[PDB]
Every structure is written in C-alpha cells, then in structure tokens.
Amino acid sequence: NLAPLPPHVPEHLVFDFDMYNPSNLSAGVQEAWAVLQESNVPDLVWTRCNGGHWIATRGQLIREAYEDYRHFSSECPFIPREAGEAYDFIPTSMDPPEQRQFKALANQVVGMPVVDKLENRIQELACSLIESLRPQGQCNFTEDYAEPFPIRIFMLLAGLPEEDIPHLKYLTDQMTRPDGSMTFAEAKEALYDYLIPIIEQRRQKPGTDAISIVANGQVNGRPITSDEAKRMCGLLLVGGLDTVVNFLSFSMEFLAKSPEHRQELIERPERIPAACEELLRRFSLVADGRILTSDYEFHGVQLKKGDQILLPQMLSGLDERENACPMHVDFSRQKVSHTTFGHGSHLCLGQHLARREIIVTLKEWLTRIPDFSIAPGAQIQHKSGIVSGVQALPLVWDPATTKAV
Numbered sequence: 001n002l003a004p005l006p007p008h009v010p011e012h013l014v015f016d017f018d019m020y021n022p023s024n025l026s027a028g029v030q031e032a033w034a035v036l037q038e039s040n041v042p043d044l045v046w047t048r049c050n051g052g053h054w055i056a057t058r059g060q061l062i063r064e065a066y067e068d069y070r071h072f073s074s075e076c077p078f079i080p081r082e083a084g085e086a087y088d089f090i091p092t093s094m095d096p097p098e099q100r101q102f103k104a105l106a107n108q109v110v111g112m113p114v115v116d117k118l119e120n121r122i123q124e125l126a127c128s129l130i131e132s133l134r135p136q137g138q139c140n141f142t143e144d145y146a147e148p149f150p151i152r153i154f155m156l157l158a159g160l161p162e163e164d165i166p167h168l169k170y171l172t173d174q175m176t177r178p179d180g181s182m183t184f185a186e187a188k189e190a191l192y193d194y195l196i197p198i199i200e201q202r203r204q205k206p207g208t209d210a211i212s213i214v215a216n217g218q219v220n221g222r223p224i225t226s227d228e229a230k231r232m233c234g235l236l237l238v239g240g241l242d243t244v245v246n247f248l249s250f251s252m253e254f255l256a257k258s259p260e261h262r263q264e265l266i267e268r269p270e271r272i273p274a275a276c277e278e279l280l281r282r283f284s285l286v287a288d289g290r291i292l293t294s295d296y297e298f299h300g301v302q303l304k305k306g307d308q309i310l311l312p313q314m315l316s317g318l319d320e321r322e323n324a325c326p327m328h329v330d331f332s333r334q335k336v337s338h339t340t341f342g343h344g345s346h347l348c349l350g351q352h353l354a355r356r357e358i359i360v361t362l363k364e365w366l367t368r369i370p371d372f373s374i375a376p377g378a379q380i381q382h383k384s385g386i387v388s389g390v391q392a393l394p395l396v397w398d399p400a401t402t403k404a405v
C-alpha cells in the first residue's frame with residue numbers, strides 16, 4: 001500500500017521502507033532496518049508506505065533534527081499521521097520551553113534518587129524470579145522474566161494492581177506495534193478510561209506512589225490539571241510496560257548464542273556496565289519522529305511544512321560512520337556511540353531505571369545460570385514498530401550446571 005508521490009519529492013530520493021513490516025525481518029529487526037544504511041541509499045529518503053514520510057538514515061542527521069525543535073516539532077511524533085495526531089502524551093508531545101516544566105515533575109517520580117531507593121527491591125525481584133526458574137531447565141524468557149520483572153517493578157512504583165497487567169500490556173502493545181485490531185486513538189482512549197478514576201481518587205486521598213505524586217504535582221507555580229496528569233501518567237505507563245521488556249529479550253537472545261560474551265562478563269564483572277552500553281547500542285529498538293513546522297531545506301533536501309520525518313534512534317549506533325563494524329558486539333569498544341535513549345530535550349527520563357534493571361538482570365542471571373542456549377527447532381521472530389520486540393524466546397539449560405546463590 002504505497003501513497004502517491006508528493007509533487008516536491010524527487011523520484012531518486014524514494015525508498016519504500018515499511019517501518020511496521022521491513023523486508024529482511026527474518027534476519028533480525030536491527031539488520032532489517034540497517035538496509036537503509038547501504039551505499040545505494042541516500043542519507044535522507046522518502047518512503048511511500050504508511051502514508052508517505054521522510055526517513056533520516058544517518059546518525060549525524062538524526063542528532064541534528066532532534067536538536068532543532070524549531071523546525072522539527074514533537075507535536076506529531078508517531079507515524080502514520082493519524083497516530084501522531086491522536087498522540088497527546090506529556091511531555092513528549094510538547095516542545096521547549098513548555099516541555100521543561102513537565103519534564104521536571106516526571107523526573108521526580110522516575111529520576112535517579114527514586115531508582116536508588118528501589119534498588120534493593122529490583123535486586124530482590126530479579127533474584128526471586130531467576131531462582132524460581134533455575135531448576136526447571138527451560139523457559140520462554142519473554143513471558144517468564146522479560147515481562148514480569150520490569151512490569152511488576154513499575155506496578156510497584158505506580159501503586160497499581162498486578163491483575164491489570166494483561167489488560168494494560170495489550171493496550172500498550174497496540175500503540176507501538178499495531179495489530180490492526182484497534183487504531184491508536186482507541187488504544188489511547190481505553191488506557192485513559194483506566195487511569196481517570198484512579199487519578200481522581202489519588203487527588204483526594206493521595207498516597208506515596210508515582211501516580212499520587214503526579215496527580216498532585218505543581219507545574220509553573222500552579223497545580224497540575226486532571227487532563228495533564230492523565231496524559232503524563234499514560235506516558236509513564238507505556239514506558240514502563242513496553243521498553244525494557246523488549247530490550248531484555250534482544251540481549252538474552254544474543255547472550256544465549258554467544259558463550260564467549262557470557263564468559264567474559266562472568267570473569268570480568270567490572271565490564272558489565274560497559275557491556276550494558278554496547279548492548280544498548282547493538283540492540284537499539286526505538287524509532288519515532290518529528291513534524292516539520294514550516295518549509296525548510298535540510299542537507300540539500302527541501303522539506304515542506306506538515307511533512308513527517310522518522311528519526312530512527314536505533315540507527316545512530318548502527319551507522320558505520322559512528323561505530324566501526326556496527327553489527328559486531330564488542331564489550332571493549334573504546335567509544336560506544338548511540339542515541340538509544342533519544343537525543344535533545346526529550347532524552348529518556350527513565351534511562352537510569354532502565355540501566356539499573358538491565359545491569360541487575362545480567363549480573364544475577366549469569367550468576368545462577370551461566371550456561372544456556374536457545375531451544376532446538378525454535379525460530380526466534382522479531383517484530384517491528386515504534387518499539388521493536390521479540391515474539392518469544394524459548395531457552396533451555398542443564399539444571400546440573402546452574403548455581404543456587
């Protein structure tokens with residue numbers, strides 16, 4: 001389904017890439033997206049899929065566009081346009097200076113001090129989850145750890161019932177990896193229907209949870225409104241349920257295939273932090289964009305007001321001009337360059353929480369289950385979207401080789 005080429009788009013700048021169903025998906029989602037970085041592809045292209053939009057294929061441009069909010073606005077960050085228009089999460093749908101105020105409050109509920117406070121709990125859940133799987137000798141990583149671990153920690157932070165996970169997770173997934181079952185506006189509607197009552201109650205009888213903190217916060221000297229609280233909370237929800245979840249599978253899929261990398265971390269644990277960054281670079285998984293606020297010429301290409309442009313955060317670290325041998329995982333890289341957590345005034349607020357959950361998982365898993373692999377006959381399938389993911393990850397191991405700690 002290709003849309004007719006706009007009058008201002010040069011025919012030679014056309015490359016029909018479908019961010020929701022890339023061609024070589026079978027080889028891995030990152031590999032599938034990296035085709036945009038082949039010699040035959042210009043730095044800035046236009047695809048006719050999903051309504052027609054631009055795509056910046058180089059780290060340099062991606063960074064530039066993200067730094068220039070004057071021309072590239074957050075107002076419409078999702079593709080297709082229908083989704084981006086219905087998109088109203090705070091603070092991502094807003095540009096600075098406005099953005100700053102809300103960013104500050106959000107940082108209060110998921111910032112560093114909060115992570116430091118939840119450390120022991122994160123460590124406890126990881127250990128408990130793993131120890132319970134260790135003797136089984138097998139599991140579907142995606143549903144047995146990748147999902148429960150980060151999500152339960154979030155529900156704990158938000159003070160929400162673990163019984164709502166299935167419902168909430170489904171709605172989130174429809175927003176990043178659309179099933180066609182429902183439009184973005186509907187998924188968004190459903191999620192807000194869930195939050196409104198809760199925020200209401202949290203305004204009258206406040207608690208210590210992130211939701212209470214947000215629902216009763218102060219922005220620009222005055223108090224936050226219900227709508228504003230609802231829109232910010234909706235964003236924390238999507239971030240807490242559909243980000244770390246997927247990243248952990250990509251990483252575990254790789255560690256399961258690379259004994260030498262597992263070994264390296266087991267012997268030189270001081271390398272884990274560095275390893276975490278390299279994996280964040282190699283298995284980057286986010287791709288959203290911006291909207292042109294006016295006609296603007298970007299690197300020789302003429303962009304028209306209203307044009308939407310995808311700035312794949314995942315491509316920056318795969319660009320050979322930024323990292324030599326991009327597809328190779330090297331824990332000892334002198335300089336690990338990436339924009340996995342974004343770039344510009346919208347740099348990820350939950351990156352500290354994320355890194356903590358990743359580093360804990362790596363350390364605690366390899367301690368108890370140092371040797372594991374992917375189940376025979378299983379074919380690991382990836383899925384593309386605003387946030388890419390793994391369908392399932394069947395792992396197997398000899399319990400006799402595990403270590404109860």
Ligand code: HEM
Nearest residue numbers: 091092236239240243244286340341342346348349350354
């Ligand atoms: C590996 C995990 C994660 C990745 C790769 C990631 C990636 C990103 C990216 C690329 C952005 C920038 C989007 C843009 O500029 O349009 C972002 C924003 C954000 N992330 Fe994360 N994120 C992760 C985990 C989290 C978690 C766990 C939370 C917390 C619940 C979270 C909350 C946010 C928020 C609130 C923003 C919006 C900040 C703003 O608009 O100013 N993220 N994230």
